[PDB]
Design a protein around this ligand. Structure first.
Ligand code: PGW
Ligand code: PGW
Ligand code: PGW
Ligand code: PGW
Ligand code: PGW
Ligand code: PGW
Ligand code: PGW
Ligand code: PGW
Ligand code: PGW
Ligand code: PGW
Ligand code: PGW
Ligand code: PGW
Ligand code: CA
Ligand code: CA
Ligand code: CA
Ligand code: CA
Lengths: 615, 615
């Protein structure tokens, strides 16, 4: 078997604990797991850690726990089909058994399982709860679709039966994104060949392609959550231990939704602190690099040009670690009963930083360096470089996808009987804690380049087509080789990223039509002076293109709503048929006016006597 | 009783039928009703009509039909609480008994009831199926809230238990609209007093008030449909007899959703035909009335000025009857399985005509007469009247609400034992066929004036506050006195009008900020020459105000989504508790690794031997 029927490993730390308090908490850790029906085996983890191997103590106690989990989904409307009895309740997959065991270890004792919250409040010494990789399943899948162009629907199901729906939704989204990139890649190679850059025809097909892909994925997510049975999964979301209720009414532990809305008002100050903090470092290091590159005409230019590129690589990550610390403090200040609401809210605070770090460099070039900078450089102490804007779009969409592939997958990888097994469990325990949000962020940031700036150099979607094929293979390699196996968390969507994709598509119709206008003479546009830009005509072309985007997006969203995908229709029918079974099994004076014409024949003849008489 | 226990009257016509074919169809009309469990009494209707009085033939056959109706709602997810057994199934109200009887008369014989479709395909002679007014309930309600400022929640429930949810939703919306108009009415009287017109402070509070009201009503509709148990009522919508299936699979009679989408493409040609047809008549009759009012300096001016006002009152209604005939032909061309989808689609085709007839006159004044018309009048063969734009907003928001009240309610009203009862049934049968869409249209068109043009003369929301109090009383009077009683149709929303209210609020943030800019010098603005309008600054003030509207609307819509109204929470809890009852009533080698430490105590001591040894 090579995994020894081990479900999870719980790593217990004692490096910061004295022996009387260490073994005091190790006892409760073991009897909490024993009480909820799990079997344990203790071994040496590290020089300072002692991890515990956990397994379902019996097929009867696991079938009952699997049954109780399906009953909880059905009661809350996630499943919609009756859960078949506990006598035949085998896990549908490995991801279902691993999710049922994970909930026994972590949900609080009033909810059914041991309340082992790793490292929060009483299990601070508990550092990790991780499952073990199925190495041969991981290696057969890796070689099997390094020879294909697309992963089958069954290949995508194999990813969720191993890693769960949250990881499976990312790969389903990335595959659908890659399949849609074939159109602008083929169209973007035509327009780059026949036409040039800043083409009117390219910019319209590109904005129309971004509308169709986002609307197609919003509908494909609903179909996919109905197929995987995670459709309303937010109703059974796991509470987070750090929550602080105000009252406690049954018991639930309520915190008012309006009180949290006042604290959420602080995100407006935070979003402006980040744009003043990051924007000042990006704009200042851009103005420097314009000076020593096009203004400073002295010696030392060979080895003085790397200053700005270096000074931003040591200042943007430093400031982003500061803003991520402020965002986490503000996220904690809001209370967030659930772990998903906490994670969704934190990802949304960080998107403000990602939008500025990722796109502000190109926005300064296209909209403050090209139109201006014959006005600026007299104060910066002109003949702007007409290829600065194109060489920067190439760097972010080609050299950043190639360089980023190296730091993402290669550098992390380069940095008696039970002795071989225990040796590799100690190796798995020192790998990384995979986060599918990091992958989703990188794909949605990449979508923003296509949406915002692809008219500059329409070969961008060819770079993304080639990159995204490799990305799907190397992201799967990264999960199987360089990260601990993620516990099979569920999801019905890629989350807050679907609204960022639509925000970037909207913003892209404004910046794309501003670029098609101010470069309609060439790629040099207004060579540094803003005189030849009719500000009214720049604004008219943005007003019409933005409202043509909004109108076409409403038409495309309303068409697709009329086309119910099949898995979504089957859950609507199945909710009807469930209620039919419940209904079949259980539930099984004036009157003188009406005494006139007794039957329907007398009415019939009273009508004949009047119909004929009236003619 | 005074209504003689009569549920419906079916008016049978024979003025265009010979006796052998008339009585041939009167027989089937009577035995179709007899078979579905109704009792009939025939009397003379008119000189050419013979209407049939219908009643539930027994309390056992009505309790069973009421029970089968509640079972159909529960099976399709409209109800969410189990339907209590047929033995105790009494109608909750008069509107529930009248709706259960109406479905017996009209739904097709394969669905349960007689297939009496008035005047469509075989019941062409059947001209009307109407219930009888409960005159004393109608008169007690009318006097009871002509003495109040607001109707209670119980008064609004009394309107739906009599007239159904579709009429009840209009009165609930009109009351909520009137209660919200107190703010801009009080604020609009402040700004008109202290400030003047075209105030920056008035225009921002007005656009912010339109956001809050629309978002508040979208949430109040969901709460109200959960309270009235019509939440997902579109799943049990009545099919329309005129539908034409392509296939027929079980049997359902399908027509492809994509085939209908191609025919719906013709609404783009229709919407442009109407804007070229109506716009040319409005713009031409406006240019005339500018000529003979400010340009023509000859005699006959006293009795030549009424030409344009007369020529548009005889041309706009004539053209609108033509476009309503084209819209109905295009609506029929699309197939529309349901009667609601047919009605919703027709209301949306007519909103294009309503938007142009209602607002284009003022839009021509504010945006082609004030900025231009010192350039136009040299070609029209200048010193524009600086009060033309204000006197026209006053006419549409004061004189049109007073004049319209007269044509709506006053002019339509001014234009042995069973002999007194039959005399008033013949009077009820000649009244009008009330349409709640006509009322909803008038309230949403009125909202558009507030949204679009109220900065001109901020006393507009005071006119609408006073008007809407009266409107609620006179619209109820009109239904009870001047129209046949509507059968108690159900609804979970005011329909397509909620998206027009949001479209008008969006457009109003563009025209309001354009008016605040070009009249920031006074109410005379640019006196006929467009020279002093900086076109870039007109466009910058529209770009920022429109995107501040969209941002504040997203923030307000996302806050309100976090605040689940109570009736909406009670249906979510009740779906859980229903499934709990269904679940309670029905549904009831490597192993050497784990043989090491049997209990949890042995693991506990193996951990002590390692914890101490490692320190
Ligand atoms: C405007 C440009 C639109 C770009 C369309 C690119 C179409 C690329 C594509 O293969 O889309 C398929 C389905 O969706 C499409 O058929 C096109 C999208 C329809 C909406 C994928 O799904 P499938 O079924 O092949 O697996
Ligand atoms: C819009 C622009 C944003 C401007 C400023 C952001 C700060 C907004 C308020 C942040 C903190 C608001 C706040 O304290 O909310 C609750 C108190 O309720 C209130 O005081 C009620 C009034 C809130 C104003 C919690 O209070 P506590 O933590 O003490 O429990
Ligand atoms: C003009 C003047 C400027 C960016 C700016 C917004 C900062 C966002 C981060 C907000 C941090 C919110 C926060 O963590 O403070 C909490 C208490 O705060 C509060 O009592 C109320 C919030 C005050 C801020 C923690 O409480 P503790 O005791 O753990 O410490
Ligand atoms: C170029 C200049 C302006 C372009 C403005 C583009 C239009 C933006 C406003 C349009 C808008 O309302 O988007 C809403 C938010 O987006 C969303 O849900 C997705 C949420 C993402 C929004 C947050 C992005 C961070 C941008 C931080 C940059 C610096 C901020 C400094 C302050 C969703 O609207 P809805 O769905 O109703 O349709
Ligand atoms: C309607 C918009 C038209 C009204 C605004 C533009 C009308 C106009 O005056 O355009 C002339 C020609 O410019 C031009 O080719 C301007 C080209 C404008 C065309 C831009 C196309 C919009 C992209 C579609 C977005 C997708 C939306 C959704 C799609 C489904 C002006 O020349 P100008 O001397 O001022 O130029 C100097 C400039 O090149 C800076 O050096
Ligand atoms: C967004 C728009 C920024 C608003 C800029 C307001 C500029 C105010 C000055 C202005 O509009 O004049 C226009 C020329 O100026 C100009 O070409 C400069 C305005 C265009 C500069 C290009 C911005 C990218 C002529 O008309
Ligand atoms: C910005 C201006 C906002 C205008 C607000 C006008 C408030 C007028 C109003 O009475 O709103 C009540 C509730 O909604 C409100 O409390 C204000 C709206 C909250 C959202 C009505 O409902 P109720 O419960 O009184 O019956
Ligand atoms: C967007 C701008 C709008 C421009 C023109 C509007 C007219 C659009 C087409 C109107 C009629 C399209 C149409 O005939 O649809 C079906 C045939 O499908 C088709 O032919 C397939 C191709 C449709 C193009 C029904 O066909 P039939 O009634 O014969 O059954
Ligand atoms: C440039 C050139 C211009 C406004 C314009 C759009 C008109 C909207 C109204 C469309 C009317 C659609 C319609 O009723 O025609 C149907 C058949 O039509 C059709 O076979 C296809 C539609 C043709 C239009 C009825 O069929 P029948 O036999 O009953 O007669
Ligand atoms: C002043 C000039 C231009 C202002 C444009 C205002 C912005 C309009 C476009 C904004 C928009 O997309 O509205 C959509 C449609 O509205 C709706 O659902 C409601 C449907 C009503 C729309 C139809 C109105 C008829 C207007 C006919 C006038 C002549 C037309 C001649 C062609 C809904 O968008 P969503 O919900 O995604 O947010
Ligand atoms: C940001 C927008 C500011 C940028 C655009 C306006 C900036 C600007 O230049 O404004 C000056 C002053 O005008 C002015 O008072 C212009 C006043 C502009 C202020 C308009 C307020 C917008 C209304 C809010 C909508 C609600 C949104 C959502 C709310 C929640 C120009 O003077 P100008 O000689 O050209 O004037 C001639 C004119 O009066 C025609 O005779
Ligand atoms: C909507 C905008 C309509 C686009 C109008 C394009 C006008 C093109 C001419 C233009 O923009 O020049 C501006 C002055 O012209 C003008 O005051 C005339 C343009 C404003 C006229 C007022 C429209 C209401 C100076 O800058
Ligand atoms: Ca990558
Ligand atoms: Ca990745
Ligand atoms: Ca009226
Ligand atoms: Ca009315």
């Amino acid at each position: 078997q090579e995994n020894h029927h081990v479900d999870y490993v719980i790593r217990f730390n004692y490096g910061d604990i004295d022996t009387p308090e260490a073994i005091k908490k190790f006892e409760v850790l073991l009897l909490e797991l024993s009480e909820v029906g799990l079997q344990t085996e203790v071994r040496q983890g590290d020089e300072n850690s002692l991890f515990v191997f956990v397994r379902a103590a019996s097929k009867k106690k696991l079938k009952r726990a699997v049954y109780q989990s399906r009953v909880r989904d059905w009661l809350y409307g996630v499943r919609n089909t009756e859960p078949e009895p506990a006598s035949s309740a085998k896990p549908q997959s490995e991801a279902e058994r691993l999710l049922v065991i994970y909930h026994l270890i972590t949900v609080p004792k009033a909810e059914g399982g041991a309340g082992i919250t790793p490292r929060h409040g009483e299990w601070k010494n508990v550092d990790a709860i991780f499952p073990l990789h199925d190495e041969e399943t991981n290696r057969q899948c890796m070689r099997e679709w390094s020879k294909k162009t697309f992963l089958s629907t069954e290949d995508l199901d194999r990813i969720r039966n191993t890693f769960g729906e949250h990881v499976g939704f990312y790969f389903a989204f990335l595959q659908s994104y890659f399949r849609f990139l074939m159109f602008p890649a083929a169209f973007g190679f035509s327009c780059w060949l026949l036409l040039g850059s800043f083409s009117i025809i390219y910019t319209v097909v590109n904005c129309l392609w971004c509308i169709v892909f986002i609307e197609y994925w919003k509908r494909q997510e609903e179909d996919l959550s109905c197929r995987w049975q995670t459709k309303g999964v937010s109703a059974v979301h796991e509470k987070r231990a750090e929550f602080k209720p105000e009252k406690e009414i049954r018991v639930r532990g309520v915190f008012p939704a309006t009180k949290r809305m006042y604290r959420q008002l602080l995100q407006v100050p935070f979003a402006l602190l980040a744009a003043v903090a990051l924007g000042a470092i990006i704009a200042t290091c851009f103005a420097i690099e314009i000076f020593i590159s096009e203004v400073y005409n002295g010696p030392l230019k060979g080895y003085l040009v790397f200053i700005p590129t270096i000074l931003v690589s040591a200042l943007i990550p430093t400031m982003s670690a500061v803003l991520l610390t402020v965002a986490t403090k503000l996220n904690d200040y809001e209370n967030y009963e659930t772990q998903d609401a906490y994670k969704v809210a934190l990802t949304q605070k960080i998107f403000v930083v990602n939008f500025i770090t990722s796109y502000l460099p190109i926005i300064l070039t296209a909209f403050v360096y090209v139109p201006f900078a014959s006005r600026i450089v007299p104060y910066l102490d002109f003949s702007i470089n007409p290829d600065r804007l194109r060489k920067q779009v190439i760097y972010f969409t080609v050299t950043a996808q190639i360089v980023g592939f190296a730091l993402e997958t290669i550098v992390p990888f380069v940095k008696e009987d039970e002795a071989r097994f225990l040796t590799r469990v100690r190796n798995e325990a020192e790998l990384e804690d995979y986060d599918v949000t990091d992958d989703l962020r990188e794909m949605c940031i990449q979508f923003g380049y296509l949406a915002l700036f692809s008219p500059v150099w329409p070969l961008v979607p060819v770079s993304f087509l080639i990159n995204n094929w490799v990305e799907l293979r190397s992201d799967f390699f990264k999960i199987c080789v360089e990260c601990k196996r993620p516990w099979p968390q569920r999801a019905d969507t890629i989350g807050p990223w679907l609204d960022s994709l639509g925000f970037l598509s909207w913003v892209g119709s404004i910046t794309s039509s501003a670029l098609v206008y101010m470069f309609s003479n060439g790629h040099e546009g207004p060579n540094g002076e803003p005189t030849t830009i009719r500000c009214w005509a720049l604004l008219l072309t943005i007003f019409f293109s933005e409202h043509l985007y909004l109108i076409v997006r409403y038409a495309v969203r309303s068409a697709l709503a009329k086309l119910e995908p099949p898995n979504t229709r089957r859950e609507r029918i199945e909710r009807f048929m469930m209620r039919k079974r419940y209904l079949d099994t259980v539930l099984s004076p004036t009157e003188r006016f009406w005494m006139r014409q007794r039957g329907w024949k007398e009415s019939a003849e009273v009508g004949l006597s009047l119909i004929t008489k009236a003619k």
